[PDB]
Enzyme design. Structure first.
Site, short mmCIF file in Angstrom:
data_model
loop_
_atom_site.label_atom_id
_atom_site.label_comp_id
_atom_site.label_asym_id
_atom_site.label_seq_id
_atom_site.Cartn_x
_atom_site.Cartn_y
_atom_site.Cartn_z
CE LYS C 10 -3.43 -2.17 2.26
NZ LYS C 10 -4.28 -2.53 3.56
CE1 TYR C 50 -9.30 -3.90 -0.10
CE2 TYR C 50 -8.99 -1.57 -0.77
CZ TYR C 50 -8.40 -2.14 0.13
OH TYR C 50 -7.69 -2.58 0.21
CG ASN C 112 -3.36 -2.74 7.46
OD1 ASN C 112 -3.48 -2.09 6.01
ND2 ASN C 112 -4.26 -2.95 7.42
CG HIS C 115 -5.21 -6.85 -0.24
ND1 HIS C 115 -6.11 -7.13 0.27
CD2 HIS C 115 -5.05 -7.46 -1.74
CE1 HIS C 115 -6.95 -7.77 -0.63
NE2 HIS C 115 -6.03 -8.07 -1.57
CD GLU C 126 -7.89 -9.57 -3.95
OE1 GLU C 126 -6.37 -10.02 -3.42
OE2 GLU C 126 -8.67 -9.85 -3.10
#
Ligand SMILES: Nc1ccn([C@@H]2O[C@H](COP(=O)(O)OP(=O)(O)OP(=O)(O)O)[C@@H](O)[C@H]2O)c(=O)n1
Ligand SMILES: Nc1ccn([C@@H]2O[C@H](COP(=O)(O)OP(=O)(O)OP(=O)(O)O)[C@@H](O)[C@H]2O)c(=O)n1
Ligand SMILES: Nc1ccn([C@@H]2O[C@H](COP(=O)(O)OP(=O)(O)OP(=O)(O)O)[C@@H](O)[C@H]2O)c(=O)n1
Ligand SMILES: [Mg+2]
Ligand SMILES: [Mg+2]
Ligand SMILES: [Mg+2]
Lengths: 149, 149, 149
Positions: C10, C50, C112, C115, C126
């Site tokens: 990310k 998402y 965080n 992913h 994905e």
């Protein structure tokens, strides 16, 4: 009161060239290197090492994968037999805890980088199998006052 | 909202020369150094620090082991009091989780490298014991937008 | 019997400049880099990524945090979908186990770092979303005999 355990870097640890990283994990806790020797494991010695598994169907392939260079080690410390097992993690790397050797380095049980004695009895047996007594060295770590209570 | 915790590297952390490694573990999460001071801990201040342990049989040996150089620290972060305790691991290194400071560096509870505040109240008290208010530094981390949601 | 998972660093992983450290954790287990691409994520592709959160109230802020540079990755290994999730740790860094990426680097769920696909179905979806088939590279690791049983 300290004890000694037998730890062995398997041929995958040698061939993936992570020997130093493995040793560093044990040195980091103040465990003392009492013995260390590179050899090439042979079927005859591996049969004695894996005597508990004699006759089982997975032993022949286990012996094949273990026939290769290995680093024989003896480490000394408080509770080091159980602690070294904890640091290695589960036999199956997928089940091993994050931060253990097998979880951090490995994928499958058949290539799980390292062996450690599972008990006081097996440590005595394994050290006798893989080492002559002159190869076990007695000395004191200079940082002992800051490692032991 | 962030909070501040008191973390102290004990004399074994100084003498084993792992101060930098310890600091790096906390910096790695984006925790901010708000205060830092090397001193030599003395019995009088240690008696106040460990006041909750007054009377206990292990306290005199704890004070003796702690009489030596220490690195006083204050770190700031989200939930950092409880998180730093989790990163330190159990009092006994042999029970601490792999990947914690005490599991990765230590063998016995009496030489377990690092102290951290166990609650908001103890953090306030310990920070005030070891630091004057003018020693606590306020600044913003440049990467704050990527550390905090 | 290997599988492939989609892993994405990310914007906070890019900006905190820990891309190499993240990659090294997966290489360390013998996972094979099958695809890799730096891009700047857009709201349109993030909406599809998402999709399972469509209509929810936190989605707009998630898309905003994620609009920035990302490193798209495909890693291959035994059980790598579940294992990469284990290595990442819980969504909330404060709940993640010591030694996981989120526990070792992060503080809050909204930042965080990484992913990873959570199932076989999501990994297939994905990988196809972020990569064309021509971008997925097939080669064999020279250490395969020492990684796989
Ligand atoms: N079904 C099995 C059983 C075990 N093993 C291999 O055989 C070794 C010995 O088995 P076991 O004693 O049950 O596990 P460990 O004690 O962890 O292995 P080691 O003694 O070599 O440390 C294991 O390490 C593992 O690599 C395997 O490949 N497949
Ligand atoms: N039976 C005991 C109890 C505690 N300790 C030592 O005393 C310190 C303080 O005890 P305690 O507060 O119970 O443990 P921790 O909070 O983990 O230690 P610290 O406050 O220094 O972080 C411990 O860290 C440990 O070094 C010990 O050696 N033997
Ligand atoms: N209440 C929530 C919900 C989710 N998240 C963010 O939204 C992402 C996706 O949520 P979720 O899929 O439930 O968690 P993870 O699968 O762990 O996240 P990711 O899919 O990116 O791996 C999380 O990583 C987290 O950054 C958040 O900030 N707070
Ligand atoms: Mg065994
Ligand atoms: Mg305490
Ligand atoms: Mg998810």
């Amino acid at each position: 009161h300290v004890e000694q355990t037998y730890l062995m870097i398997k041929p995958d640890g040698i061939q993936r060239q992570v020997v130093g990283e493995i040793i560093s994990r044990f040195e980091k806790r103040g465990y003392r290197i009492a013995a260390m020797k590179l050899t090439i494991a042979t079927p005859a010695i591996l049969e004695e090492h894996y005597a508990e598994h004699k006759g089982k169907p997975f032993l022949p392939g286990l012996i094949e994968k273990m026939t290769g260079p290995v680093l024989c080690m003896v480490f000394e410390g408080v509770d080091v037999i159980a602690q070294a097992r904890k640091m290695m993690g589960s036999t199956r790397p997928g089940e091993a805890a994050p931060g253990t050797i097998r979880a951090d380095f490995c994928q499958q049980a058949g290539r799980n980088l390292i062996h450690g004695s599972d008990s006081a009895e097996s440590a005595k047996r394994e050290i006798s199998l893989w080492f002559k007594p002159e190869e076990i060295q007695s000395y004191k770590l200079a940082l002992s006052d800051y490692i032991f209570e």
